[PDB]
From a paper:
To determine the molecular origins of these processes, we compare here wild type β 2m and its [name] mutant, to investigate the correlation of thermodynamic stability and conformational flexibility versus aggregation propensity. β 2m is a single-domain protein, characterized by a seven-stranded β -sandwich fold typical of the immunoglobulin domain family; β -strands within the protein are named from A to G. β 2m is the light chain of the major histocompatibility complex (MHC) class I121314. While β 2m is highly stabilized by the interactions within the MHC class I15, when β 2m is released as a monomer, it may turn into the etiological agent of dialysis-related amyloidosis, a condition triggered by renal impairment and the subsequent chronic accumulation of abnormally high concentrations of β 2m in body fluids. β 2m deposits in joints, bones and muscles, lead to movement impairment, bones fragility and articular pain1617. The introduction in the DE loop of a residue endowed with higher conformational freedom, such as Gly, relieves the local conformational strain and results in a β 2m variant thermodynamically more stable in solution, with a decreased aggregation propensity. The three β 2m surface mutants that we rationally designed (V85E, [name]-N83V, [name]-[name]) were produced as recombinant proteins, purified to homogeneity, crystallized, and their structures determined at high resolution (1.75 Å, 1.49 Å, 1.70 Å, for V85E, [name]-[name], and [name]-N83V, respectively).
By calculating the change in the protein intrinsic score upon all the possible single mutations at these seven sites, we suggest that the V85E β 2m variant should reduce the wild-type aggregation propensity, while two alternative specific mutations in the [name] β 2m variant ([name]-[name] and [name]-N83V) are expected to weakly (the former) or largely (the latter) increase the [name] aggregation propensity. In particular, for the crystal structures here reported of the [name]-[name] and V85E mutants a closed AB loop conformation was observed; by contrast, the wild-type β 2m, [name] and [name]-N83V 3D structures exhibit an open AB loop conformation. Residue 63 lies in the E strand, in close vicinity of the DE loop (residues 57–60). The [name] mutation triggers just a minor reorientation of the DE loop backbone, but is responsible of extensive, though local, side chain reorganization. In the structure of the [name]-[name] mutant the bulkier W63 side chain flips away from the DE loop and towards the D-strand, compared to what is observed in [name]. Such movement has two consequences: (1) the shift of S55, F56, L54 and F62 side chains away from W63, and (2) the DE loop moves about 2 Å towards residue 63. Conversely, introduction of the [name] and N83V mutations (added to the [name] mutation) did not vary significantly the Tm value recorded for the [name] mutant.
Numbering used by the authors: 0 to 98
């Protein structure tokens, strides 16, 4: 058996501007086993519809997921990614930051 803690990156496809559509990405990678729970949060609340999920095993046997959705940032909305995995003692929250 192998277990490996996910790497978690949260970033937009383009630099952000209010009014302009964009995409918010969670790239969760290098983990094992493949069982995992990954949510995008908007103002602390789970985003139900996350349009896209690209995912696979890597050559090294670990797993990766790109979890993303269209979003239009505003001044006052904060976003984060919440991940749970057997390697984590509690859920891991990674905030989105622009820059």
């Amino acid at each position: 058996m192998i277990q490996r803690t996910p790497k978690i990156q949260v970033y937009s496809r383009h630099p952000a501007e209010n009014g302009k559509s964009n995409f918010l990405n969670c790239y969760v990678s290098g983990f094992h086993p493949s069982d995992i729970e990954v949510d995008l949060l908007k103002n602390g609340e789970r985003i139900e519809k996350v349009e896209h999920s690209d995912l696979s095993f890597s050559k090294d046997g670990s797993f990766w997921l790109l979890y993303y959705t269209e979003f239009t940032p505003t001044e006052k909305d904060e976003y984060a990614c919440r991940v749970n995995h057997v390697t984590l003692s509690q859920p891991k929250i990674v905030k989105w930051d622009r820059d």
